[model samples]
Each structure stands twice: as structure tokens, then as C-alpha cells.
Target: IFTLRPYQQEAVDATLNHFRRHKTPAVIVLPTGAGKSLVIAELARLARGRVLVLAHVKELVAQNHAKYQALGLEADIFAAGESHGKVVFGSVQSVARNLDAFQGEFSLLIVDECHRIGDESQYQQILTHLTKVNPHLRLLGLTATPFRLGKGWIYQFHYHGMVRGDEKALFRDCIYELPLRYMIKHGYLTPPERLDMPVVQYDFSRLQAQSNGLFSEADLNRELKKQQRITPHIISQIMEFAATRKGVMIFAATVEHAKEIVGLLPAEDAALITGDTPGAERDVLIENFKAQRFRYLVNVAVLTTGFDAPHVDLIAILRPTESVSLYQQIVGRGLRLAPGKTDCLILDYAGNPHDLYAPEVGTPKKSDNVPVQVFCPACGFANTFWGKTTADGTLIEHFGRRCQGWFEDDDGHREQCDFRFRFKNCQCNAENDIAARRCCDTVLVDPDDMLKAALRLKDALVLRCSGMSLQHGHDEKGEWLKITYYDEDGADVSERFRLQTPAQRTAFEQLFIRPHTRTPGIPLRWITAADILAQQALLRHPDFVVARMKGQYWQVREKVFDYEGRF
Candidate 1:
């Protein structure tokens, strides 16, 4: 039996606690290669009643069932089969067809890769039927990526403004999340090393995105087919890099692209697998690749999830991904730890603009293109500029070099202001706009608070915590834990956590105590001020606090620890 890691155990515990408090569905977010299978197995083993586990594909169903069986427990597979047991693992499509076989038999429903759960998807169809049969059915979902493409986040609450409203989201809340940087810093997964640049890169700047901010399949194929000469040059570069590497996985743009890539490599050493490949042939190819019979594997939208080959040390992204979630999933294929592998290599020929360590924000829609508020440095007037929010919640202005605020003359006549927003300082001690051709000494002086001015365009900010203090407070309802965070500039931000219920206490523990505790399995029942004050020294201070402005106060969204030196 494999022992659960600290974070994995916390995930299981958090789910159980969530079920005890509310009837709403909950999701757990763990980065790829963080051993989500073990958490699923342990939860099924400890479940009080019968459990039903659902996945999208047959491979994922089999993989999840295998983990549960490896724990010396018996379970049945209903996936490309029909069976009934205390713990049943099945694919969503297969089980949805044979719903009569197990009606109201399952008390707990667990969905793997649950981000694929849409309102009209097979997973949702199964869930709707199951919920109708058992009104009290408990729901739990697990996935590495919590957000979908068009939909913002699978869960309702988010630190960033990714979630618009709460009606359409399936998962009500996220019980626990394990950061990718945490796993890499603690040696839980292999670090990804990036190459400098490729000799020839695919130019996707001319490709147009649809209203969903994603390129269409037809458009992608048309554009990629035009780059016939670039493919061979990219393959030659891959060959040069793969001479010393053990396993190389390349994500092609399309099926034709995959075929061309495989043709470039030696026939005996390379293999290609697409979505239309037969199951038996695909299985053979994957097994051979895992056994080291082949050195290179080219795939198109088939091996992103539920396909594990730990020896894959090099990943070449040949497709453009508009969302950070898809980019992370593709990169995570090589993050698994192998016997002699120290790190993985990532060569980006597609030029995807995503920070590997930033939080996962889904693709923005065309309707998300709203105007942002930027205050003029010279006149102190708020001006609106059309901009788009990046994957990290930072604003990238589309246009606006000069302020558009109105100014009134002495005669009470209003006229358009001509204040330029310039910050680039030249060697001649004069500031100019970034697009300016020459410097002007008559220009208004630039502000010295560059960081604060830049932060105005951002949706979130990371403030390093210099100190923290706790105090006792009470309202009409009950007592609370008043915590204050101090920054380097002596600015303080405070938050209050009520000790009125177990759920509230668990929320506080999940944020502050569980992450920083040195000892595993520490009892976390803090009901009063004295109970928390006694263990004050045992609580480790956060390295940074992620916050966003609400109205006039900065609301604390997340507390980050041990992340300053990672990523």
C-alpha cells in the first residue's frame, strides 16, 4: 500500500469535512503528477456507503480502478463492461446507458477529470439521473485543472475575477488546492527546463481567434499546412536535441502535422497516434513507447490526460493554446519523476504566452473585452482605456498613450485634456511615452510610484508579508479571530474569521494552519481565542498575500507560503 502524501491526505480530509457541513458539490484541485489516483483510492476505501466513480474515457476508468484494486480492495469495472460491486468504477458514457442496473445504489458520486462536466455533457446526464434517484446523493470532483474553456471556473469562488456568476458552475466550492510550485520546490515532481529559442518558429500572429478566443480547427489546419518548410526545420532541431534524451513527446497541431512529424523521424524509433487510431493499435504503441522500444511519440489531442509515461523528458509544443489550463496540461505530461531523470526539457516552437507558474485562468470570451480604468499621472483624472485581461489577470492595453480626461479653462469652458501618460525615462533626464520618437523637457514629470501606478491596471497584487498579529474581537453574533498582515512599508491589512461553526474553523485551518504545520495529523479544533493563542508560535507566517480591491479595502484572497524561492 502506498502512503498518502501530506497534501493528498489533506485533500481527502477536506472533502470529508465538506460533505459533513454542506450538501453542495465540492471539487479538489491538485496539480498534475501530484498523485490524484491515491487520493481517489483512499477516499473510496474510507467511504461509508457504496461509491460510484466516473471518468470520461475507458483508459481513465481502468487506471482509476487499478489504483483502487492495488490497495488490496475489491472493486468492479462498469466501463466498457457491466458489473456491480460495493465500489463501482465506470466510464460516464457506458454507465449512462445502463443506468437501470444501479439506481439509487450509490450514495457518493466521484468524478475524475471533472472539468469536462458541462450542463449537457454525458457526465451531467449521468449526474442528473443519479441525483433524481437519490435526492441526498453526495458529489465530489477531482481534477488538475479546475476551469473550462468557455466557462470561467468549474467552482464558484475564485481569487481572481474569472468567475462571473454562480448559476452555471457545477462545482459549488473548491475544498483544497495544491500549488504546482509547491510540488516542484519540495521535489515531489520533476522541474521543467526550457530551451532558449528554436531556429525556426511557427508564426501564429496572423491566425484569427473566434469569439471564444480560440482558433478553429479548420483555420488551424489551413494555417499549419501553409508552413510546409518550417516543419522539417523544427523536426531537425528536435532530432538534434533528442540524441541525448530518452523519451520525447511532441504535440502536433493536427493529424496531418503528426503524420509529417513521424515521417521525418526514423521509422523504427518513432510512432504516431491520433484520435482515430484503433484501441488495440494505440495500446500497443503506448506500451512499446513506455518499454523504451521507441524514443519518440507524436500525438494530437490524445495523450494530454490519463496517459502516464514518466520517462518522457522532453516536450515540444507545436500547437498554440489560448488558455493556461491547456498549456499546463500539455507541459505536465513530462513533469512526472523517472528513475534517472533529473528534469524535463520544454521547447516551445508555438510561442504560447503563458507563465508556467501563474494561477490557471480560463480563456477569455469576446464579451470580456471591457474598458479598464487608468488614472492620468498629470491631471489625476480617471480615464478609461480599452484593454484585455491576460491569463494572469494583468491588463494589456489595446490603445491609449494620451489621457482623454476633460479640463476646464478659467472662462468655465471645458476642453479635452492633452496629458500624455509617459514613464520611459531617457538619459537626458526627460521622460517620454513608450511610443515617443523624441524626448520633450516640457512634458509633465513622471510619477516615482511606478509599482503602485502599474498595479492600478492589474486585477490582483502580491504583497510580501513582513509581520502578522492576532487579536480577539466580538460582534453581535460571536467571537472572531482578527488577523492583521503587515507589509514592508508598514501598511497593514486585516481580516476576520468567525469561530461560530465547524465549517468556519475548517476554512481558517485550510488557509493558515494546515499548510504551515510541521507535524502531520495535528488536531485542528480551535473554538475560541485562547485555543488559537496557545498555538500561535506553531503557526508559520505566510511569505506573501494575494489580495484584490473590493470597494475601498483590499480583501485577502489567498495566503502563499514557501513560494518566494520556487518557479
Candidate 2:
């Protein structure tokens, strides 16, 4: 008799029901942490005939064998070097070719990672013979995600907004889903800081969004090297951060790059392991890693699956690309709830800050739970499959241009005019009915304010303006000022004193291209037609604004805003 968590019991019940109802090959799509293994084990014990277990990876094959053993079921390991036992566990590497001769063969078949089964040739090679040979056989497949292709499905499940059709038709009434938000929220996993690296700008999205995601490593390496030459200094500043951390795991682009990073560390500080390392030797190195003898083990692509280094504190990405699923898998390595692991720091050398800034709703989710309040930016969409309520019980949306640029809609999302990086306010509470001026449609300015700030309109006029709010007499003259400075007790505050407009605003506006503030404090002053131009730029840019807003494409050098961070 095998034990099951309540959720696992539900999964088992659903799978058995699905098999009976479909009466054909049915796939069970479950998330990782929700416990697919237990459901499979339950299926095996309840099976009416001899069971044949199939898995893709050798480690998974080994793991399934253990799952069967825990349930006291007769099990065997049939992969290369694995000793075969009674109820057989065979790696697809072997059993894909030779499963014909076993006597009184399997009555029911269990396929692991069966999302990969749709391939016709391999499906026929490994499974067709079983159907041809066995008199009566039932097949149950377990996979993470059912739809591998990116096209939107139009079943009863939510795609763009609300429910539409038969969800079972698309992914089969999702038995269970464990959204990453749930795992991170309830302390099942570590929290992450979204690292934005606008500086080391990457163009992989250009490639990924192309014909077939066939970007060449040679081309990638050359571009990266060229970028480093332009930045000129930190090909490895983040490595210092890695050295300070314990049990750090880095995912690099190339084998040579991995070696180069490992070599930079103290011989005792790090080790480099790759797939080409012999299996027996790799196990020893992995064992040493588990023992914590080495501080860091940097690898190209070898450690993503079975190498579970739970205590890993940091993840360094030397090479960045455009796959959210791949990024999720790599980051998920450190998400295991290990003791003392409060959270993990992700140092992204590649330009993917927007990826970090966006909410992680699209990562491959387990079929176990729902997301609460998660919002999709492309659609400005908020849904239960998007976010979770916080401990304080507040629902705040964090990812995707906030409120679809509400601040910009009412504020500004324009590029800085080369003439003035400083902020300018509208004159005389005069509402410029012109949309090109892009002034606030509301916030009436004082008549005196517009007069002092009125400049003669030329073919090209740069208008001085605040966020359309007039604070005082000087605001009409095109001088932006701030008031509303206050203390906790609402006493007189010194920041209330006059603030100086700095020349640095020009440089910062060129750098970040944002407006400073909305409070209009002073007013008065105007110029005739001679001083006007096509448009006036924000006098002083906001300390924090996004890259260039929508406009005519101008050739400009990409800026790397990747900071060392507040920590």
C-alpha cells in the first residue's frame, strides 16, 4: 500500500478517471513540485497487468526506480550499467530499441516526459511494436507541458482574457497547478531580485524571434567580445560577486567561456565540470560539490537537470539569450527551499532587464495551482493566473509598464529634445489644445504663469512646462519648481526651501530621458516668437525613466544601466 499527499491522491484519482473516460492514450500534465512521481507510483500499484516504465534521462530513470521501490513495488533498472530487476525501469536510450523479448511482457505502459512522444519516428520505434505485439495495452503518459508549440490554444482555458472552450481539449482539465508565485510566496522557494542590464545590451531577441532560433555561437561570441571591448572594463566584475558568495552556480554560453571563468577563480575557490568529463569522474566532482568542498562549480550546460545544489546563493549569467523557459529552468535550480537560503541574487551580464522587470507568469508551470493577480503587459491584463495576495493582504501589480504607463499617459513618455534636458512648465494656466505639445489636458495653469513663459511660436517650438501643474508665479515664466515638502508632524520643512535647477539635468535626460516632478510652485515670465522651437524638452528629467519612448528612430549608442545594486 502506497501513501499519497491529498493532492497526489487527487491526481491519481483524476488520472484513473481520465484513462477510463478517454479509453485511449491520455497524457497527464503535472507541475514538478506537485508530485507527478507519486501519481505514477499509484498507477503502477493499481495496474491490472505487468507494467513497463519508460524515461528519457538516465537520472530520471534512476529516480523512477527509487519511487517504485519506496512503494514496495517490484522494480528493475535497465539502463546501461543499471542492474535490471523485476518490474522494469529502462532508459529510453536502450528500451527504445529492445523491449520485444521479455516474457509475459507489460500489461500497461507508463511513459515519462511523454511531451517528447509526439515525434513520429521515435514514437513508432519505441512504442509501436508494443501495440503490435501486446493483445491489450493501456498507456499513461506524464509530461510537464502538453503544448510545445507557442501558438495560442482556444479551448475553455483562458488565453487572452476570459474562458472560451473545452480546456480538456487543450491541456485536459488541469488536475493541479503550482504557480511559481505560490512556491516563492509560501517560502517553498527563494525570492529573486530582477536584475536589469541595459548596458550590456543584447540582441538575442532579434535571433529568437527570427526563423528558427538558430543563432550561431560564433556570431554570439564575436558580438559579446565586441561589446566587452566597448565597455572596456568589466568582462568579469560580477565574478568578484561570485567569489564572495558560497556554492555559486553559473550558466555560461560556451565551454571555453566556462573554463575561462573557472580559471579566474582561486584554484581552491572554484571548479569547472563539463559533459565531456567521464561519467564516473563527473560523479566524484558532483559528490565533492554536494560536500561543499568547492565554493563554485561553473558549467556550460551540464548541471541544469540532476545537479541539485540547494545551497547555491548566486547565479551568474555570463551569456544572455531570449528563452524564458530556459531561464526559468536555470533559475529554478536555486529555488529549492534549502536551510538559510532566504533568497538568491541573479547577476545578469546580458541585457535582459526588461525580462527581469516583467512578472514571471509565462514560466513553465506545474499543473497544481493558480496564479493570483498576475498581469500581462502586452495585454495590460490582470488575472488569477498572474499574482498572489501579499502577507499584508494588499493586491499590488509589479510587473509590466505600471498601469500601462499611467504615469506616462498623464505624465510623459517622450524622448528628450537635445536643446533642454531641464523641465519646463505650461504658462498662464493656458491649456494648449495641441496634442503635439503633449501637456496635461487638465491641471489648469494661472494666466500670469503663461504670460511670463509665453514664447513666440516658430515652425519648431520647444515649450517650457511642468507636468501641466502650476505651483506659483514663476511657473508661468517656464521655471519648474516643487512645493508640498512636509514633515511627519506636518511642521515646516527645510527641503521646502528653493531648489536649484542643475546643469546635470541635461546629462541625465540624455542618459535616462525622464521628467523631474509634477508640483508647480513658482510662476511668471514669457518670451516672444524668437525663443520658440518645434518642441520644448522636459527641463529637468526624472531621476528614473525608461529608455527612449516611442518616436522617430534615432541612431544612438545603447546605454548599460546595469547597476552594482543597493546591496
Candidate 3:
């Protein structure tokens, strides 16, 4: 019943091969919306064990249970209800609390939302119990983020070996990982427009006067902290965002704040929901929103996860939170890679460039750390700069901005240039372009400067990085593997970099490059030793995963899934 997508099937094939080689716990990492649950469900079918599927939420647990059933598997539900069956679908909390029966018996356990377990003691305790019940048990954990949010490899408790994030790694050796670009081109979701409203400076004096004796100075500070405290201003922006998009969801800071927001919005276009909203009414509201009876969903943090309304193209960030997970949860709501969405428009009033761009902010901007002219904070040294980075956020610094560089003509190509943006708190603002010259009348700044160059490079790299191409793989059996992936495209791999011979491997070892796994499919065609030597450069490339030489054919390892070609 659960037909494998091309990539997913490939991943399964790979995983099954790994299972045959060894009885070890493995974790597969695919992007959000990729069928992680489906892969595990299929694994459960193949592996002979009383499978225990764990999820973080009752809804997710229910979803997994439903999927298993729909696939013609009657798994027991230990989350919403108690049942005795070979398969058990239980929330982590439930399983943690009721473990006497689950302690032993189950040969295979499929942990859903595996990342959520983290370093929590309770989650660890559950794993301990599983081992106590059956020392020989085989555990297969799954999650998108293999790395923990805090610290420690909590997965070590359940899994001895992990497949990591590649779709083929989890589902099969060969896979099909479609990207958002294809869906967007095909029209599965809505695209957002640049509707950035001009910043509105506030008159604090008027607000203070209006408050009178009603609120204290501290209270005023708290209220003023809200960027959209002005009821009318928020209403206008919300209306504007909703005007074009099919629907909108506003994440409020609090319940009272949500109520205040709903008051400003047209009562008909909006409805407010919270954790306190009765399930029945919330269901009706959700149904209405889905039916297009309403255009706005104003809430205090409800739609961040689980709820999927495909047409919601706009997200108004009215509340400020520094959490990366919170930012991801909120933004991920609109980033489902649906058809019509060219890009999910995130209107942030928080001004946090970091959280707004997935916690990768301020680490480094991609450039040669090309020293931009800077008036030193202490000495006002305007052209005496010292660092650079690539445009994709890579950072580097040396005697000059020479260390930082980006792709010029594609490939691992690098160019030398110098310039840097002064960070805040820096005592310098006067910046200068490289090769400063006073010979010309008007200090020739290359008027176009690097603006056009940077934009063009950024656009090309972004598209090159996007996973728009059809790359689903086929297995030896000629089948489709269902899998999805993200090709960030910040890096590229070359064939010769990964060699399929001991001679080339020895050369790479001398060059400080390493290859732990051989590429799966080397099309067995004989090639000359010189041809193999020429392809040896692939080992040095950081993007290279694994490679092998099949007959005369050299196959560099790229992520592949079992062959389900369905997009």
C-alpha cells in the first residue's frame, strides 16, 4: 500500500544491504516533507521484529499509525489507545511511562521524531529499558537533524550505526529526491511577493500620554516592546499580506495579544485559535480556513507544526523569539516547497538577521574577507582593513581580504578581491573599494562597484544550488525509490576527486584526502590506469561522499535511492 518513491526505494535497498551486513541501529536524514516515516514503516515490514514506532505528538503518532494501516498494516496504538499487536505506535511520553509490556519482546523499534529525544534523561531511560528487555534488539532511529540541538549524541543509546541524511542512505542505495523548484514550477503552492512595509517610526511621547495613570513606566516599556502594538498599523500590514496570498497565519506573542490582533482585523477574515481552543471548534475553524471561508489564522503559536494548509503563502512574524527551533517551526510552516511558492515571504519585525535566516547569521558572509575600507573604531584607519569571506557566508581573514573568495566562472573557481562590510560597534564607517587610487579627479569607485557582480554571482549560485533537476536514481532491479532531499549547492563534487582504485586511493591519502566508502554503482567498463589517475582528484574535493571503479567505469558516490521514478 505504501509504494516507494524512487529515491525512497533506493534508500531502502541500501539500508537493507547494510542490515544484511550487520545488525546495527541506523538513522536516515532526509529533508522535511521527505517520507522518513514511510521509509521506516517499510523497513519494519522487511525486518523481522515487533516494531515499535515512536513519535513526539499524539497527532504525529496518529499519522504514523494511520500510514501503517493504510499500507495494509494493523499496528497497535499505545498513544491514543492501548492495544496488543506486533506493531506498537506510542508517543515517547506514553512509552516512557508504560514500559513493562514494551520492555522486552519487540525485536525492531522504529523511533519517530528521533531528534526530539536529545539528551533528556527520560528519553535515555526509555532506551535503557528497551535494552534491558531485549539485549539483542535492533533499533532504527530516524530524524531530519542527526546532530543534537544541545549536546551529546543521544542517538548513541539506540543506534550503533547511522545512515545520516542522504535519502538513499536510509531508504535504499538508489533514490529520487525531488526539490521545491519542480513543485513551484508545477504550481503546488503559492509564491509570495516582496511586500516589505516601510518601517514606521513611533511617537513614544503620544503613547505615554494616552496611557495616563492606567499603566506604569515599566508596563509602557513592555507594551512598546511590541512592534505592532499600534492596533491600526498591524491590521494594515496583516491585511496587506493576506490580500494577495490565499491565506495568512499571524503568530502572536500571547493570547491577549492575539485577541487584540483579531480585534483589529476584520472579524470575518480572521479567527483566533490557541492551545486552549476546544478541539471541535478548532476543527471547524481549520475546516473553514481550508474551505477558503476565511483568509486569516491569527494565533498565539499553533500552526508552527503538524497543521498543513498548502495555500498559506504568507507568514507575519509579530512576536520576537531568539530560538532557532522556533524560527524553523514558524518559517517551516510556509517553506513546504509547494508548487506556486517562488519563495516563502517572511515579514520579520524582530530585526534579528540571525533567526530570520536559520541561525547561520553573523557567522560569516561569503567573500574573501576582502578588507573593506574601514575607519578603525579606535584609530579611524579607513582603508587599513584585515578580513574577508565568500558570499554564501564563508568567512576568512589574513594580512588582507585575500583569504576570502567566491566562485567566479563556476566549479571550484576562486578569484582574488578585497572589501568588507563594517559590523556594528565597529568604530569605523568610511569604507573603500580595493586598489584605492587618488590619481583620477573623482576617486573612480567603479560606480557599478561589486553590486552587480555580487548580485549576478548570488543568483547563479542560488539556482545552481537549487535542486531543480530530475536526479531520481534507478536500482539494478530497475525500480523507483521514494526520497526527497535538499541540494544547497554551496559545494560541488568532481569525478576524478573520488578514485575507484587502490593506486588512486594511495595518492589521495598522501594528499590528505579520505574516502571511507566505495561508490555503489560503478558501470563496470575498463579504463586506462592514466584515466584512473586523472580521476583521482575527486578525493581532494570536500563535497565528494564515496566512489568506486566498476570495470572500466569510475562511479563517484552521489546520494542515490532505490528506483521509484514517480515525482
- Give the clash count for each candidate: 0, 68, 83
lDDT per residue, candidate 2, 497-526, as tens digits? 122244433433323223221111111112
TM-score of each model, paired residue for residue: 0.61, 0.52, 0.48
RMSD of 2: 16.7
Scored by lDDT, model 3 comes in at 0.49
Top TM-score: which candidate number? 1
Comparison by TM-score, 1 against 3, better one: 1
- Per-residue lDDT of model 3, residues 1-567, tens digit only: 478766577667756775675566665544455555567677767756577887766767877787667776577786646455567888877778888867547777767656565426656677788888778776666554443222323232112111212222232211122333433344433333434554542333333222112223344446655645565676687687676777787776667777877888887788888878786777678678756788878877533245546667777766543334355556656655555556666765543233332321111222223333323223222332333433674323322211122223455332322223221111111233332434322342332332234335422211112221112233453322121222464433223323345664455443322221111111112243343334432211222122334455334333221111222
Model 2, stretches more than 4 Å misplaced? 1-3, 28-34, 67-74, 82-87, 97-108, 115-124, 133-136, 143-176, 190-209, 229-246, 268-293, 301-304, 353-567
Error of 1 at 219 (Å): 3.3
TM-score-superior candidate, 1 or 2: 1
lDDT of each: 0.71, 0.48, 0.49
Candidate 1 per-residue lDDT, tens place, 1-567, comes to 458889989988988887887798888878767876677777767776678988887877887788677777678887664345468888988988888876746678888888777534666678888888888888988888676565567876432212322557778667788887788889999988887755889987778788677677788889987888898899899989999999998888888878988999888698888888887988788678778889888988733445558888989888987666677778888898889989999988886764677544333523334445566666666555545545686444323445545544688454444554322333221233233433443453333343344357577665678778889878887778888888888767777888777787778776556554432122444658877777665565666666777888878775654332331
- For candidate 3, the 10 contiguous residues with the lowest summed lDDT are 515-524
Which stretches in model 1 have alpha-carbon errors above 4 Å?
A: 1-3, 81-86, 97-105, 119-125, 159-166, 302-305, 363-567
